[PDB]
Each structure stands twice: as structure tokens, then as C-alpha cells.
């Protein structure tokens, strides 16, 4: 089977700007860096920033709903939202779904999200107000 | 402090096709499904397939290097590769490294990867044969 996510690779246009953002702003730990990439960790997750000649800034109106969500502790959600806003981050969605969620772009427009709450919590919420046609696989 | 990846959401064009691919072919466990999405897991990873009116198939040469790598056991790599090849999966890249990596597309073109090996293993391989400009953070 697929055991887990091995690593997330994001195409970037300016490695220096991207490392600053992911390592200093978002606080990921930096393990290695070379001319055209960087390896970082977020918890267990291996995140690779990869220089790609073809990458440009992609505004949120062009890119679709594909996005990457990172877990924050409940008491950390507010101060981290605040830190991101003050850094002038672009908000791509207002929150309306289950749990504190905060939606912001990376320096190349990768759609990011801060989120408090597991899948278990989302499933719990969906048991009470199901989405249209919802079917839970545990039958 | 972001604590971990919370979930990966992929925009899809055809939820039925995508669920079949992710759940049946790739074998992720399905937890829930509704009219415009599904929730699956891959180990500790929450994966959400989300129907998006704006999503079409994106040819691998039209999208950049952004990709999602998934861990497989070493004994699982070859047989999983061939099972994917036999299913008519598209290969978007030749593995030119010395590690085990298989590059393939989901039904909408999301770039995925089977990979054997940890960050620690890549690093150790990089110490032996470093990339240009390589800096290793272990050096205070």
C-alpha cells in the first residue's frame, strides 16, 4: 500500500524568498539547501522547495481549489493568523467550514491553509450536519 | 509553529473516476464521500478529493514540478510500479537518480510519486554525492 506521504514538493521561482517564507515566517525547520532547492520539515513531513524555471506567481483566481493545510494548536491559531496578516500575506478564502481555518498564499501563490482539527473532528461535524449526499464508509 | 501537514486537498473534475483511482488502484482508505468530495487517508495523511468546476486534465508538460510523493516499502516498489503501468497510468518523468522513484499522474494530472527512502536517506546520499551549492544545516 501507499504507507504515507513521503514528501511534498513545491515549485518555486525565487528560492531565497521561498526559504525565508517557509523557514522564518512559517517556522519550518531547514535541513539542507542547494542552488536549486531546499529540504525542510514540518513535524514528520519532508517538504522540498524546488526551483522551477517555469514557475511564475499564480494568482488565486487562476489556480483551482488544490491546497495544503497545516496543523496549528488551538491557542496558536489566532497569534499565527495575526503574524501572517501583519506580514501582508494574501488571503484567498474567508473561513466558513469546520474548525478554525485561515487561507493564505505562499510567495508563488501556492494555496496554503492553517487548520485546527483532525479528520476525526471533521467527520464528527459531518455526522451532525452532513454535506449533500454524504455517505460514511463505516457502514 | 505549524505542527504537521493537516490535509492535502486535490481539485478533481470527475469525483467517481478520482475515488476509483485513489481508493481502488492506489488503495487509500475511504472514510466519507458526498456529492462534491471525498475524504481518504494514506497512513496518518488526510487526503481530500474536492470537485472543482474549474479543474480540467492538466498535461504534465503544462504544469510545473509541484508533486506529491508517497512512501512505499522497498519490496512493494517494483510490483506496485508494474501494477500502476498495467493500469495505464501516465508516467511524467524518468527517474534519473540512484534511489527508487516512480513518477505518475492521477486522472486529472496531479503529479504523484512512489518513493522509497526517508529525508535522512536523501541527505546521507547527498553527503556522498552533493548537489551544486549544497549546504547541510548540521554545521552550527
Curated annotation (Swiss-Prot), chain A:
Keyword DNA damage: no
The entry's keywords: Antibiotic resistance, Cytoplasm, Manganese, Metal-binding, Potassium, Transferase
InterPro entries referenced in this protein's UniProt entry, alphabetically: Fosfomycin_Res_Enzymes (IPR051332), Glyas_Bleomycin-R_OHBP_Dase (IPR029068), Glyas_Fos-R_dOase_dom (IPR004360), VOC (IPR037523)
GO CC aspect terms: cytoplasm
Record GO biological process: response to antibiotic
UniProt-annotated location(s): Cytoplasm
PROSITE patterns: VOC (PS51819)
Function as written in the Swiss-Prot or TrEMBL entry: Metalloglutathione transferase which confers resistance to fosfomycin by catalyzing the addition of glutathione to fosfomycin.
Complex formation: Homodimer.
Protein name: Glutathione transferase FosA
Native species: Serratia marcescens
Amino acid at each position: 500500500m501507499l504507507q504515507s506521504l513521503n514528501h511534498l514538493t513545491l515549485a518555486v521561482s525565487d528560492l531565497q524568498k521561498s526559504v525565508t517564507f517557509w523557514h522564518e515566517l512559517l517556522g519550518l525547520t531547514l535541513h539542507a539547501r542547494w542552488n536549486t532547492g531546499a529540504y525542510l520539515t514540518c513535524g514528520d513531513l519532508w517538504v522540498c522547495l524546488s526551483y522551477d524555471e517555469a514557475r511564475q506567481y499564480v494568482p488565486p483566481q487562476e489556480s483551482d481549489y488544490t491546497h495544503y493545510a497545516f496543523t496549528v494548536a488551538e491557542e496558536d491559531f489566532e497569534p499565527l493568523s495575526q503574524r501572517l496578516e501583519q506580514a501582508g500575506v494574501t488571503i484567498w478564502k474567508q473561513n466558513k467550514s469546520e474548525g478554525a481555518s485561515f487561507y493564505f498564499l505562499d510567495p508563488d501563490g501556492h494555496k496554503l491553509e492553517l487548520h485546527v482539527g483532525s479528520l476525526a473532528a471533521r467527520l464528527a461535524a459531518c455526522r451532525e450536519k452532513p454535506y449533500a449526499g454524504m455517505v460514511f464508509t463505516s457502514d
